[PDB]
User: What shape does this take?
Amino acid sequence: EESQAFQRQLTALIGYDVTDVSNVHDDELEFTRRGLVTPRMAEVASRDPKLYAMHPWVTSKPLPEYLWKKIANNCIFIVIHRSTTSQTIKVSPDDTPGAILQSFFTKMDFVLRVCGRDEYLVGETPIKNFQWVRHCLKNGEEIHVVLDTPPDPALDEVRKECDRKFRVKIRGIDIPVLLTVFVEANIQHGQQVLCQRRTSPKPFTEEVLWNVWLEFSIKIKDLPKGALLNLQIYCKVRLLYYVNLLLIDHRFLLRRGEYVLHMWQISFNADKLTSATNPDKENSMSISILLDNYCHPVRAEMPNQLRKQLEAIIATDPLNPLTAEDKELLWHFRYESLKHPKAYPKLFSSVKWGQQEIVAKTYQLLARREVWDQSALDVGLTMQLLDCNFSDENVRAIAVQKLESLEDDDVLHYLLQLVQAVKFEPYHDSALARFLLKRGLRNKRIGHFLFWFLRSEIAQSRHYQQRFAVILEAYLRGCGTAMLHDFTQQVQVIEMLQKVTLDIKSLSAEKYDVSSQVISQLKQKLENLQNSQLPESFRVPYDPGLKAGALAIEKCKVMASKKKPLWLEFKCADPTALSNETIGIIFKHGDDLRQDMLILQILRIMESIWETESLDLCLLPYGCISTGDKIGMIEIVKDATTIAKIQQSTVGNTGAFKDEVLNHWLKEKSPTEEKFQAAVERFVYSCAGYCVATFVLGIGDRHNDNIMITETGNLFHIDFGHIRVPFVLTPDFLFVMGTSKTSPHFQKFQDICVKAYLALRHHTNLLIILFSMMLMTGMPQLTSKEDIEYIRDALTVGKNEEDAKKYFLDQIEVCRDKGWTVQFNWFLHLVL
Ligand SMILES: NS(=O)(=O)c1ccc(Nc2nccc(-c3cccc(C(=O)N4CCCCC4)c3)n2)cc1
Assistant: This one.
């Protein structure tokens, strides 16, 4: 009974039971579980036991100019410790950890490990290329390391185990409880409706029947792999219910027989694409159908003017619509289009997918992919082939092929969007799902995040938990025994804190002030938790290098906000840690943290864009992971406060705002004038960073209670769930900058803003694809073409840089012209 016990262990880890068949009409999930064995085993056998155990976090990107500034000597200072003794050593930027190790004995079995972190500076890499080294250089910190024995790879031990038209009979529809109603049947492939048929409208009663065959113009031989039968109910004509059925199964068989499909009720989006059925069989709407159908499935140069029209089509942004003329030209000139990697999304949208001979021709075109294979990886371009507009296996596989060249550093930037893009896959087993599994199995940091990202979707997505649960098991069956124990300890702690979060929430109203009553109750529930249930220690989910110990209960509190988040603090479970600082984690219910995750990740990507142009915009995209429905954890950036709180420390709970208050607060919060000048510099940069980022994302218009600042001048926006001024640049921000006109700080700010804004515009398409993907996968509501179009207008598409500069400076002027108006209107709306 060891085998069942291990499965029982995996089930608690996943947050779902993969061995359950309650909501299946086929064996695709069992087939995927078997399908994923070999990809996992091939990777486990390939991984370096030593490098896997120490997981160096490295990049092959050049040191940015802004970071070379701190090395104007060509020397890097590393503090090598051993108990009370610690010696500073002079190192070259090109020096490898082994070279630093040898020269250490020259001055005075072992490996260098960061103080208070499961972070190792090891392998054939210049130290300047380790992330922690670059983290320290950016935040002027000393590079403190420890001399210790490497971890034992034995801990990572892996446990050994037909020419006729298509038709569908719509029998009827049934709901036990809930007007006119009708059914719409769609043959879909890439959100594209190849064929549509409707039934007659009828009164909406608990059981509505038709028994009418809906014959489609398309032949059974012409149905492409990944084609969906989309069944929708309409009740003003509003969509009310949907469900999908993959017409061709995982084994390439045409779907046959009677189907009783439990439908999703509407509350456009990735949830609308799911082939999963609503698991609630007692209350949901049902659709009964019958599938009868039987089957088993030297060029001429372009003229000067046509080539001009073709290139113009390829130059347009990703959300530019294709005319039938555009599609015809892209298709007729297939072979010329092939020489332009940027044409691939537009060219693949020109393929007549519901024609077997065209598909065959598309596959013919792909067989000779020298130009694609040789192209410089373009993540923006590659992500476009992994969205909702492409169901083709072969087209999606060529995009995955390009992601194979991404280094760990880059996989981490895109991991979240790549886990989400799995929602766009017609089948559970895919090249993308196999790529995600492989990379997670290859690297401990990717794997850690892959665990939490899948777990987040498994906990709350009825539409995708089944598929996502199968991928997580596949990752859990090869990560190793140490990681399996690691995850079990994080899961136990989060499970235990989620319950405490909910019970406290169930003791306090919306904004009804936090009293000693609920505070006593928190410290009581935490005491019972710690004494028995709380394990030894655990890795911090949004910071796997950090290890949290015992709860500092005396420091734990209930925050005064509508939602009642827990403020928790833990001792670092690592003796070698230089600081005597606790780990602060917020546990919250009430906000959809999935949206925040997506926003926070786009910010880290925006930081990476600015880095490739030697810019540091001082963003603070704090750790955040969604653990369930409206619940999750937030990294406490200690010694920070809300902009509204600074205003209320002087004038109280009034919209009556003052300008000098933030500047007063910063000077008052500074230990020396040197540090105060540094803080104004940090403010100018971080303000600019957030003004460009939030403007680009259409999340600029915000209430100051959702804008925070550190005692070190670092501004940072918070609470991104469920979201006039283009951005926040109020009189108090301007006063810190020396204006109330112009200023050397205000002019520096305008310059930083312009530089950052044009740096983002050089990655317009990448930003368009990440944004649309986010709107499609993160928002529970259905998305329109309008919502997606915002970012195109904000990125001043088809505009010169001088015009773009002119544009961003006008946005800065609107914030000056509006002053405190919008902030005051937010206070009247939200505070009252
Ligand atoms: N002095 S204080 O206002 O209690 C305070 C609050 C938070 C932090 N540190 C931090 N560092 C990163 C992200 C977030 C953060 C992000 C999103 C939401 C919240 C939040 O739930 N509150 C509600 C209560 C007031 C503030 C916002 C906090 N906080 C530091 C101090």
Q: What stands out?
A: Residues 481-505 form the longest helix (25 residues). The chain has five domains: 1-161, 162-294, 295-480, 481-638, 639-824. The CA atoms of residues 48 and 152 lie 12 Å apart. Residues 559, 561, 565, 586, 588, 622, 634-637, 640-642, 645, 718-719 surround 0VU (CB under 6 Å).
